[PDB]
Every structure is written in structure tokens, then in C-alpha cells.
């Protein structure tokens, strides 16, 4: 599936990933700034955390519990989009799904 | 992934899935009863619902607007776990995922 990540800084990256590769795995192999695994999708850095954009919340779903309780208590406030790109994997529904990486 | 499908008539069925099927998918290719694919994943004939079970609500996400509305017109029972099984897709999260066939 085609994913896209806007890093608002400097443009869209389109990437195409294979289904079952969770979010973060797709940013981090193809060079997408500003999502970094440094717990290895353990819901602890929160440093993958990324923004769905709004057409696609619905469809990604919210936050899983540990997403939502370490996402509201580590950095940013999250919104309705906000999740950590190490929980969500992508599959053929996603196929077009654009995601915000929160940057410097 | 392991998925299990609930007959709360006979038992648990118990499923090895590839990721990037749909459930309904996994259910019509293993011969899960109930589970029929009449519109083949159109949001449509909603012969495909199921009700995702316990802590997997949150993990898979409520139904999408296509799902929520096909199961409001058509008078399905919804409740908090009821997805159209055509719009779930199989991803490595839901390894263990339990979901019940409504049935008869
Ligand atoms: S990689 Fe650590 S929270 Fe996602
Ligand atoms: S197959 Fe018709 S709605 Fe799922």
C-alpha cells in the first residue's frame, strides 16, 4: 500500500509498503525524518509518534490504551489523529494513507 | 496471526491468518460458518458482520463510516465491537484476536 508522509517542513514522502509492516518499520527503512524506534515499538519513547490526517482517523482507528496513556503524558497533546506509527500496521485498507510526522 | 471465531453455538474456531487478509477472507477460506460474502467486501450485503470480543475492541478500531452506516440502513444489531469483517484486514496486532459470528 501506498503511504505518504508529510513532513510540513519540506514536502510529502511516498512510500510503498508491503502489508503487516507496522508504520514506524516503513518510516524508518525509507529514510522518513523525524520517526525514530528507540524502544522498538514498546510504547515507551514515543519517538515515532505520528499524526493521521483526517480523512484517514477513521479508518486507522483511535489510539490503542497504551498508545493513549503514554501519548498523553509524555510530550505533545495528542488529538483525535495522534498515534505511535509503531502501532499501527498497514494493511490493504491503507493503501493512499497520509500521515503528519510532528518535526523540530 | 491466530484469529478465533466464536460459533456461541458450538465452539471456537481457530485460524492461522496471513496478514493483509480481510477477516471475512479468513473466514470464508478456513469454512467458518456464518460468515458470507455476498457483495465481496463492498459494504453492502453486511452477511459478513461479526462482533470483535473483549480487549480487541480498542485494538481493532471502531467500525468506518461505510460500516457504521450499512449497519444503521440495514437495522443490524451494532455494538461497540460490531465490524463488517470485509473491512478488517489481518495485520500482525491482531495475532489471538477473538471475534464472534452472529448466528442464527
Ligand atoms: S517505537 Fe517507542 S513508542 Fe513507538
Ligand atoms: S461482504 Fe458484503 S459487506 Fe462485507
Redesign the interface.
Known sequence: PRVVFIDEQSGEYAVDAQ??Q?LMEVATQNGVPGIVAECGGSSVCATCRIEIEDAWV?????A??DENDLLQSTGEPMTAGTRLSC?V?????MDGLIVRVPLP
Open positions: 502489508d503487516g507496522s477513521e479508518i486507522v482507528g483511535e490503542n490504551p502501532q500496521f498497514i494493511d490493504p485498507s
